Enzyme design. Structure first.
Site, PDB file in Angstrom:
ATOM      1  N   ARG B  53       0.799  -1.217   0.000  1.00  0.00           N
ATOM      2  CA  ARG B  53       0.000   0.000   0.000  1.00  0.00           C
ATOM      3  C   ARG B  53       0.834   1.271   0.000  1.00  0.00           C
ATOM      4  O   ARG B  53       1.179   1.809   1.058  1.00  0.00           O
ATOM      5  CB  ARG B  53      -0.962   0.004   1.190  1.00  0.00           C
ATOM      6  N   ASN B 115     -13.886   0.262   9.572  1.00  0.00           N
ATOM      7  CA  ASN B 115     -12.945  -0.228   8.566  1.00  0.00           C
ATOM      8  C   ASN B 115     -12.472  -1.674   8.790  1.00  0.00           C
ATOM      9  O   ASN B 115     -12.474  -2.501   7.862  1.00  0.00           O
ATOM     10  CB  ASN B 115     -11.732   0.703   8.480  1.00  0.00           C
TER      11      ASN B 115
END
Lengths: 241, 241
Positions: B53, B115
């Site tokens: 990421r 999340n």
């Protein structure tokens, strides 16, 4: 070579042999004298209007296990019943063996109010689905239920059991695993002006009341999850909520 | 000419031009600094695990209309928010422009309990649908709601608006006109252990709270009937009733 079920015809019917035709696949019940279930497949090519109704004893069955036209004599007057179709005439009359839609194995004594009311209205909407551009097939399984004594046909000495209710399970295109579906169940006593949308039920409820397993070729997990969830197909037939 | 919507991408977004990539199609909001909606298409070939990421400013946007990595400085400690993905990384990381899944136009400050809880579980189930033999595509549209002040990122001076909730509308295979679908809406404060099944809503609710029209290329009648009816797709994702 004719598959009128797509995802497995029902199991649990009283006969081990089912009659397979282009018009429908049917499993007869020799005790009640009415079919346990009738599975059919509507396509753009199956509808046909204006065909005649010559009732007739199904020649594929032993005459002692089904009714004959003479058996309905006096029935409307005594019970207010009509000769109702299980597999619908107008939705399937374009097939090659269409006269079989009028064989008495595909008929039962249905109260006129139901036959001419909610039931006819559902037949009309079921047939209209095939007019949608993206809908190429309608697979339906229909049958009766036997919950309470409904009396006897006055014109016959044959042992028979008049159904107390009727059900219809429908899905479009390929399979309920990925396509919209619906299930309806009407008691013989449904009032003439009843809205068929008020009779949506789960497939599970039908199975529990009939002893059949519908869409029997589906993976177990799909059967478990979808059979207890009312479908949304009725929304395309004009129903709300 | 990459179609990530199949039945018409949403209308109503603040921008007149949307970014179209293999990974997704996105409509940016230069005022909030977050995308109004992100539409993507999962197939058997799109998932990929273990990608890294590397957050990055979307090179296709004007830097003043989106956030940069520096903007999230101190955000987790101040607001307990994570850099949450709109189009999911693992479900789409096999596409050719997969790095764009980590562009900040595809990210918003999402409370970590949401999340890492219900949102992550829905992403897992959504990706799992593609493993079913008869499911060839999953088409999803996802986005934020802006209904209450959520505060501000401490590390930036850009004007921006943090979402108060997130939604996801999903359908499989071809079109919701004939295939199963689902819609979910989660508030930013959804507890860590919440079951995502409790947050099923109608597409109509989402449209009404966002001002968008989802599946905008569908016939009017299909839109009217199906958007106000919760779908049955969640039943294939482990939900009941």
């Amino acid at each position: 070579s004719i598959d009128n079920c797509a995802v497995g015809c029902p199991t649990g019917g009283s006969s081990n042999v089912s009659i397979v035709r282009h018009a429908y696949t049917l499993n007869n019940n020799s005790t009640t004298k009415f079919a346990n279930w009738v599975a059919y497949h509507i396509t753009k090519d199956t509808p046909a209007s204006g065909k005649t109704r010559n009732w007739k004893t199904d020649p594929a069955l032993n005459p002692a296990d089904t009714l004959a036209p003479a058996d309905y004599t006096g029935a409307n007057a005594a019970l207010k019943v009509d000769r109702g179709h299980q597999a619908p005439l107008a939705s399937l009359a374009g097939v090659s063996d269409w006269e079989s839609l009028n064989y008495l194995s595909n008929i039962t004594p249905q109260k006129s109010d139901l036959n001419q009311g909610a039931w006819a209205r559902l037949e009309d909407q079921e047939r209209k689905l095939i007019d949608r551009a993206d809908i190429s097939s309608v697979y339906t399984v229909t049958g009766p239920l036997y919950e309470r004594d409904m009396g006897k046909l006055p014109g016959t000495q044959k042992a028979h059991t008049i159904p107390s209710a009727y059900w219809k399970v429908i899905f479009i295109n390929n399979s309920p695993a990925v396509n919209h579906y619906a299930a309806f169940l009407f008691d013989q006593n449904t009032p003439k002006g009843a809205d068929f949308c008020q009779f949506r039920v789960t497939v599970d409820e039908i199975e529990k009341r009939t002893g059949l397993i519908i869409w029997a070729g589906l993976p177990d997990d799909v059967q478990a999850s979808l059979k207890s969830k009312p479908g949304v197909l009725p929304e395309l037939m004009g129903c709300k909520n």
